[PDB]
Amino acid sequence: MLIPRKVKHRKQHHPEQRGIASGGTSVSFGDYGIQALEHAYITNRQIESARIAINRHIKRGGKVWINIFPDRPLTKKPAETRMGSGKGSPEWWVANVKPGRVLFELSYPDEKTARDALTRAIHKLPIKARIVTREE
Amino acid sequence: TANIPNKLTANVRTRTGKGASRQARRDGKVPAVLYGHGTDPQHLELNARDFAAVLRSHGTNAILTLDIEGTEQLALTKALDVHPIRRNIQHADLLVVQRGEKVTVEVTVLVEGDATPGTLVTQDANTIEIEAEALSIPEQLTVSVEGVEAGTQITAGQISLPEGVNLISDPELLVVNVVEAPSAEALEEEGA
Amino acid sequence: MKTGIHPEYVDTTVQCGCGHSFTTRSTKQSGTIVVEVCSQCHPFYTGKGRVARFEKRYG
Amino acid sequence: AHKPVGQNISEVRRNARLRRHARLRKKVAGTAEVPRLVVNRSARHIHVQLVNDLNGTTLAAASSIEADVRAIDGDKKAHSVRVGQLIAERAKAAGVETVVFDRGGYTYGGRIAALADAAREAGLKF
Amino acid sequence: SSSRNGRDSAAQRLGVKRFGGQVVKAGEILVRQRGTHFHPGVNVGRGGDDTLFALAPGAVEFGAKRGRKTVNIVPVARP
Amino acid sequence: DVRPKITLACEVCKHRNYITKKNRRNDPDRLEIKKFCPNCGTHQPHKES
RNA sequence: AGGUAGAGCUACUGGAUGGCCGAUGGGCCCCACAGGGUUACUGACGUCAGCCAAACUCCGAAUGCCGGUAAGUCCAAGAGU
RNA sequence: GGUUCCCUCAACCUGGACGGCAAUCAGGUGUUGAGUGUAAGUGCACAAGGGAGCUUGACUGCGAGACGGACAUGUCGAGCAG
RNA sequence: GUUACGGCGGUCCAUAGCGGCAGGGAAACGCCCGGUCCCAUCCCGAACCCGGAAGCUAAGCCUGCCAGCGCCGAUGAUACUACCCAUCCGGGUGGAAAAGUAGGACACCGCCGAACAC
Ligand SMILES: [Zn+2]
């Protein structure tokens, strides 16, 4: 699970979920990629589950890139307490995803197994998504 | 290498702005700008379907001959504005060129062949820069990975360019990096 | 040069064991010094009692 | 081919003087009512001017290059007294009677102080 | 548990008091600030706590001299 | 108190004209300093009480 | 006069993805020492490409605010002080 | 603290007895990344940062004009005389 | 009035800077010679100061040409936004960036003084 070594500020406001992505909206490293169509917070637990799913399908060969990182912490206050008395301690790390962003990439010799592998990863994510290539 | 300019009909716009450009797109048009050494930019319009057909069969660096109110003009496609989601063509830049002029252009490099069965191919740089005539720009650049064994850095200086085409980018870029194929244990440790 | 902060400094004269003499200026109140090694004496420049004790009693 | 390694003392001396002349000019300034007396010194001559900083114009100027100053058979400081008296005559011929002194960066003393006291006994007050 | 925060200090009402073209008297405060974000210009002085005030009546005018933002006072010609 | 309050008095008319502070570790002795004395009308030596 | 929305980062402080090069360490063999190559190894520094931030900013709006001015409403706003 | 005058750091490269990453010395590159008693922010290389000489304005009688303000408080200030 | 000339200033202070190549000593500007005198070094005439005129334009300074780096930078399009339509999509009128592109650019302006000419 991806976790930053240190963040300057531990308790932060919620990342904004407006607009579409400014940068990262194209495939740079691999041949195929997963492009987002909705806003969400992608947790590191979902990223780990979504790249293991890609691994189990291509088995040996091929390379996988992850283009997003869980940098921003979301806090949760302790259970069954009344409102008030401070702000809760951070629990899970998310990545602010906007439509147009490319999340994962893959480089595999054949097409059908690479497109099938990415579909298994999309079903582990809380958003609509599609498979894109390097061509216009 | 010689090319034939693609005929397109360009109408001079009457009104410009965000309201007028949105209306033009809804009618199936693309705003475009014709600057260059003419040094008096013309704000033109192009048929959306006909313009994109030229790009499909000739690439982004497509030479064009335009019909502005009855007068021809050689133009080059300089840049395209594309919506990330809808994959539109919201805008286009056209640069005036004349025969014999040298222009610096980014062309795509394509990987072909079948290397050693125990290797994985990873192309790093998608495009490289060249400098050719107005009508003598290659539509693609081709590299071959055949019998290439283990780790070899194919370099931008080893790409076979046609006559009259000079590489502009530095000759030490890493274009294709053939590497030993990852194993099931290399997949698992990479990314956690 | 400030007045009363520096060591007293007077021209001197060096005389070597090879007969060489100079005319220099140093801090020594004596006015002259004698040295048995100079630029003309030391072997490394020129390239040329324990020694005498073994060369007299024993040969 | 000869490639010098550092900075000649001439460059070090020149940039250091302009550095300490601008630090000076952060206070003194020239006005038509009360002009500024700028002095420039070299190993051979000495120069003065009356500069109006409001519009950047020079009122009067005396220098040691003049033929009559060269005839003096003193030392360098003897010519500085001559140069100081000339600027005081020229200052008062243009209605100027009060000035402010701009020593130009150089230490106030010796040749510079000889010129200023020559222009003080001659009528100018500063 | 509780929160260790909750402190703050009184707002000091800093800022530009007289803007460009605005006629002022002598000794009138123009800018209140901490450092010299604005440097004094002609007929403007700097106070003990880096306050810019007018040294002569006129009209405020902001400028720039040698990369520094400055505040200047220009006179108003009598009818 | 390390830094106590001290009163400086004129050494001519013995008038207590000023009050200030000093560190009685760095300055164990009575502070001697010249200040304007309004009664005398001129700068006079002022010494701590 | 601003530093918000936006955007940008070899423009700073932090976070951070993948290549290339290669000091430093486990070393291995160089019979023990200085004396050279080797990594399913760890990898500074630099560099190529893609990014992120309420308490990041080389940048930077629309509005809003302060002042001047020309008119408008003007048998009324039933205004302002 | 006041005033007058002078100066440019941090880091990196190279050469030097102990001496080493790092002490003191020398040359080069270096425009602010160092430093500003003390938190942060706004500033400061023109230096508000480093060094030296003299010194007590860390004054007395006053203070046009302003900032901020329920009120009581609080804050800036040219200039006159001793 | 002419100059490959010397001072003092300005520009909402790099379009002016860094780097490279080739050149200049008429007066001035410099290096330069020396420490008797004013003056000086937390040691040192290196620096500051003073008295000069054997050498040199090798450096500073100045002139010409370069677009390698830094710098300026549109038009158009987009992001964003005030007001207004719109039953959860979105749109209209007005304003309008940052990045990038075509390009610009090896400064411009003013007052005195020199040598020569008139
Ligand atoms: Zn008394």
Describe this structure in words.
Chain A: GO terms for molecular function: rRNA binding; structural constituent of ribosome; tRNA binding. Chain A: Belongs to the universal ribosomal protein uL16 family. Chain A: Binds 23S rRNA and is also seen to make contacts with the A and possibly P site tRNAs. Chain A: One of its GO terms (biological process) is translation. Chain A: One of its GO terms (cellular component) is cytosolic large ribosomal subunit. Chain E: Keywords: Ribonucleoprotein, Ribosomal protein. This is part of a larger assembly, with chains A (136 residues), B (192 residues), C (59 residues), D (126 residues), E (79 residues) and F (49 residues). Chain B is built from 3 helices and 12 strands; from the N terminus they run βαββαβββββββββα. Chain B is mainly beta. Chain B folds into 2 domains: 1-98, no CATH class; 99-192, no CATH class. Chain D has one domain (27-126): Nucleotidyltransferase, domain 5. With 79 residues, chain E is an all-beta fold. Chain E is built from no helices and 8 strands. In chain E, the strands form 2 sheets. Chain E has a 4-stranded antiparallel β-sheet with strand order 1-3-6-5, with no helix packed on it. Chain E has a 4-stranded mixed β-sheet with strand order 2-7-8-4, with no helix packed on it. Chain F is mostly beta strands and 49 residues long. Chain F has a 4-stranded antiparallel β-sheet, with no helix packed on it. In chain F, strand 3 (32-37) and strand 4 (42-48) form a beta hairpin. Chain F is elongated and about 35 Å long. Chains in contact: A-B, A-E. The interface between A and B is medium-sized, with 26 and 18 residues. The structure holds zinc ion. Chain D binds 3 RNA strands through helix 1, strand 1, strand 2 and strand 3.
